[PDB]
Design a protein around this ligand. Structure first.
Ligand code: CLA
Ligand code: CLA
Ligand code: CLA
Ligand code: CLA
Ligand code: CLA
Ligand code: CLA
Ligand code: CLA
Ligand code: CLA
Ligand code: A1L1G
Ligand code: XAT
Lengths: 73, 85, 166, 164
């Protein structure tokens, strides 16, 4: 994150044989684009939703500086 | 103050006290350059070369952000030009 | 009309300031921004560049009170962000700059704070207005020279690998 | 200009004169929202006192322990879990008993921090200047302790060394 090598958080995502709640077939990534659903739970990837909320957080924090307050801008 | 307007163009105060003082001959070419740069950055990050995890290029991203901006710069350029600036 | 550029006219916003007003603004940036904000930015750049030039030069010559400090001020950045010193300096710099927002916002709004003024004269090197103006001009000239010098130092020390001559 | 702590900023309107320890330190202008400085001073002084007691307890627990085994843990954060819940609930109930009457007191009084606590009468006979000097001493020591107790907690959570 500090080094800017943000791709490292997307390397080695959860495989297509991952059993939810267990380490079998898991990965190490935390923020990924995968799209679709988990092959086992038939639901969105947890790494997809974490990345989604991080992007939403950055966007809303940026957008929260729009209106004027005690600092002239 | 009084950003309300009814003439041909709004007063320069609507541009803020940073764009209110830019000559239109500066904003115009700057807006065109920003639009061209942003379009090229968007077409280089995507379209011409498909996006990949290993290829994000903050320059192209930050660049692409100049396209939305360009819109604002040339709007301000027109506003300055019509206000004799 | 300008003192620095005889061809181009004198900038409209530059009439007199003890910061070294020689009327050098060919692109008219003083018309864009308030002069006070630009002066604060220039003084900040001056001080940062002077500190950085002195630190680069010294740390290449005599800087090793340990093991991780055995670098050549070109690989020093990565080594010492791994060590954790740059993190602490960044924390304190962020605190100082966050305080500086209010200082910049208290000026440009009223008050009386001159650009770049932090009331930091513990040793009282400046006594009266004349000394204050003379040393403000001296500080800004030294800071501009240090900006250019540090630019040269980094560009040369990245174009090759060497010592003080670079 | 008017701030002593930040000699360059001008302090906010509510930072002036009285309420000892006033060094003009409110860059964010938090005092501009509070109706008065009574409640914020009460909170600051409560934090100062709790932090002084916390630092003293940190050091003493580092060096001195009660005869029982349950109090033999040297790490204060580990002692937070090793100590039986009975002792901690007794401490919490004592604090809450002290806190409810002062809860009635704080939100309305002119000096919410003045709890009338002076068993040794260290303030009886002292002049106004001496009393203000004592208040300044208390506030200084409390702010330093707050910084110190937070540092101790952080260094214990980050390295496991409770001291030094
Ligand atoms: C010319 C000045 C200069 C330049 C070019 C850089 C450049 C850089 N610094 Mg840096 N730094 C500087 C001055 C400078 N610094 C100063 C003056 C200090 C304080 C004394 C620091 C303290 C500092 C720390 C503490 C860290 C960096 C890091 C970094 C790198 C991370 C950039 C990134 O990916 O964004 C990341 C993007 C975001 C965080 C959000 C967007 C980058 C190469 C980081 C690193 O690991 O570098 C390898 C890091 O952790 N810098
Ligand atoms: C038909 C479309 C249209 C037109 C002609 C205008 C015209 C105008 N708008 Mg406007 N606006 C529009 C749509 C439009 N608006 C929409 C859809 C929004 C979002 C809801 C806004 C939000 C908006 C704001 C917040 C402000 C204006 C302002 C203005 C005036 C000056 C604009 C300028 O030079 O800024 C030049 C701006 C820049 C050079 C900065 C870059 C701006 C880019 C576009 C931001 C990119 C990020 C964004 C998320 C995408 C001008 C009368 C200003 C005004 O009237 O002041 C009182 C002003 O403050 N507009
Ligand atoms: C802009 C100001 C600035 C910045 C960002 C740095 C940044 C740095 N200096 Mg430094 N330095 C500076 C000014 C600065 N210096 C000045 C003015 C002097 C002269 C007193 C020094 C003297 C100095 C020495 C003697 C050493 C550093 C070192 C370092 C590095 C590790 C930090 C550390 O432990 O020492 C802070 C780091 C890259 C160390 C290092 O690894 O350099 C090889 C080291 O040993 N600096
Ligand atoms: C050539 C070096 C130089 C000179 C002449 C000055 C001159 C000045 N500085 Mg300054 N400054 C410098 C470098 C310098 N600065 C650097 C590198 C930094 C970064 C740490 C600062 C940070 C700084 C702050 C934060 C403040 C000043 C202030 C001042 C003014 C009053 C203090 C004084 O007399 O300093 C005299 C300094 C010297 C004689 C340098 C000797 C050091 C030997 C090493 C004066 C115009 C104050 C101000 O703005 O007042 C208007 C103020 O608040 N300076
Ligand atoms: C619980 C903490 C606490 C609280 C409630 C106060 C409250 C107060 N302080 Mg104070 N102070 C504190 C801690 C605190 N202080 C510490 C630790 C120091 C030492 C640095 C000081 C130093 C100090 C000075 C020098 C002065 C005051 C003053 C004041 C009064 C006016 C300012 C105000 O309204 O801010 C209200 C403050 C808060 C509501 C706290 C908000 C919490 C922020 C967001 C802190 C965020 C964390 C922080 C950035 C980092 C902490 C982590 C770690 C590094 C410590 C007010 C009674 C001024 C005074 O006497 O006026 C009468 C004054 O001149 N304080
Ligand atoms: C913020 C205040 C505070 C809090 C929450 C605690 C909390 C705790 N202390 Mg403690 N302590 C404090 C201040 C505090 N202390 C101070 C100021 C001193 C110096 C006299 C001590 C000296 C001390 C010793 C010697 C021991 C504890 C121990 C303990 C733990 C078991 C409770 C006990 O036996 O208390 C005992 C409390 C006292 C002997 C003195 C309390 C004095 C109060 C605060 C003054 C008002 C009455 C518990 C986590 C025990 C433990 O488990 O060790 C890790 C233990 O052996 N404390
Ligand atoms: C039953 C126990 C109890 C009760 C009723 C109170 C009541 C109060 N405390 Mg208090 N306090 C307690 C225990 C208690 N304390 C303990 C054990 C400590 C640690 C030593 C503190 C430390 C403390 C500080 C440092 C401060 C207060 C403050 C306050 C006042 C405002 C609290 C507030 O906003 O409500 C919050 C409402 C809640 C329901 C809190 C729940 C939070 C969860 C349970 C945390 C776990 C109020 C008089 C403040 C004050 O008086 O400012 C003037 C203040 O600054 N307290
Ligand atoms: C009150 C001033 C003060 C002093 C003298 C120290 C002193 C020390 N700290 Mg420290 N610290 C402080 C405030 C302070 N800290 C604050 C306010 C924080 C943030 C809450 C920290 C967070 C902190 C961490 C995270 C660490 C230290 C560590 C250290 C030691 C190196 C040294 C004993 C380091 C150490 O050696 O831990 C044992 C370490 O890892 N401190
Ligand atoms: C203990 C230690 C290290 C070590 C040891 C041992 C125990 C000693 C020995 C062992 O053998 C090894 C080891 C590792 O353990 C000590 C570390 C060194 C320290 C403690 C020194 C810190 C350096 C300070 C710097 C480099 C700060 C730079 C200043 C800036 C200012 C920025 C400004 O922009 C701001 C924000 C406002 C502007 O207006 C103007 C200015 C002021 C210019 C940054 O630009
Ligand atoms: C306890 C204290 C004061 C206690 C006073 C009390 C109870 C007085 C009570 C009374 O007067 C009243 C109220 C009313 C009177 O009628 C009755 C009595 C009963 C007489 C002040 C502490 C004040 C404590 C202070 C100021 C502490 C500062 C601590 C620092 C700087 C520590 C730094 C470090 O801990 C770090 C940060 C990291 C470590 O690794 C390294 C070091 C260096 C150890």
């Amino acid at each position: 994150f500090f080094s800017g090598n943000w791709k490292a958080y997307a390397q080695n995502p959860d495989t297509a044989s991952h059993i939810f709640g267990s380490g079998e077939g898991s990965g190490t990534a935390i923020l990924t684009f995968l799209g679709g659903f988990h092959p086992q739970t038939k639901s969105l990837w947890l790494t997809d939703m974490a990345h989604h909320h991080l992007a939403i957080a950055v966007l809303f924090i940026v957008a929260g500086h729009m209106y004027r307050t005690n600092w002239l801008i | 103050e009084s950003t309300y307007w009814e003439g041909k163009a709004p007063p320069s105060v609507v541009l803020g006290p940073f764009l209110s003082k830019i000559p239109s001959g500066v904003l115009g070419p700057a807006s065109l350059v920003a639009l061209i740069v942003g379009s090229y950055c968007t077409h280089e990050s995507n379209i011409f070369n498909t996006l990949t995890v290993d290829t994000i290029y903050p320059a192209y991203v930050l660049g692409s952000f100049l396209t939305p901006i360009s819109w604002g710069l040339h709007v301000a350029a027109w506003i300055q030009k019509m206000n004799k600036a | 009309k300008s003192k620095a550029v005889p061809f181009l006219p004198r900038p409209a916003a530059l009439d007199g300031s003890v910061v070294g007003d020689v009327g050098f603004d060919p692109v008219g940036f003083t018309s864009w921004l308030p002069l006070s904000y630009l002066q604060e930015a220039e003084i900040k750049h001056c001080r940062i560049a002077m500190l950085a030039t002195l630190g680069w030069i010294v740390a290449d010559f005599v800087h090793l009170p340990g093991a991780v400090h055995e670098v050549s001020s070109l690989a020093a950045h990565d080594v010492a962000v791994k060590s954790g010193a740059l993190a602490q300096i960044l924390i304190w710099t962020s605190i100082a700059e966050a305080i500086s927002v209010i200082a910049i916002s208290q000026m440009l709004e009223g008050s009386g704070r001159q650009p770049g003024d932090f009331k930091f004269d513990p040793l009282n090197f400046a006594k009266d207005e004349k000394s204050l103006k003379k040393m403000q001009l001296s500080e800004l000239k030294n800071g501009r020279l240090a900006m250019l010098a540090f630019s040269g130092i980094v560009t040369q020390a990245a174009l090759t690998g060497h010592a003080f001559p670079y | 200009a008017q701030s002593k702590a930040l000699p360059f900023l001008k302090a906010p309107a509510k930072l002036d004169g009285s309420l000892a320890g006033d060094f003009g330190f409110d860059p964010m202008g938090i005092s501009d929202q509070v109706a008065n400085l009574k409640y914020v001073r009460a909170a600051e002084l409560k934090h100062c006192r709790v932090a002084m007691l916390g630092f003293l307890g940190w050091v003493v627990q580092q060096y001195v322990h009660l005869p029982g085994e349950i109090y033999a843990e040297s790490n204060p954060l580990k002692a937070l879990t090793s100590v039986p819940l009975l002792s901690q609930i007794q401490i919490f109930l004592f604090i809450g008993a002290i806190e409810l009457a002062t809860l009635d007191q704080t939100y309305t009084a002119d000096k919410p921090w003045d709890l009338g606590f002076d068993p040794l009468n260290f303030s009886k006979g002292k002049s106004e200047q001496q009393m203000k000097d004592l208040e300044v001493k208390e506030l200084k020591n409390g702010r330093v302790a707050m910084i110190a107790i937070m540092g101790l907690i952080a260094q214990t959570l980050y390295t496991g060394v409770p001291l030094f």
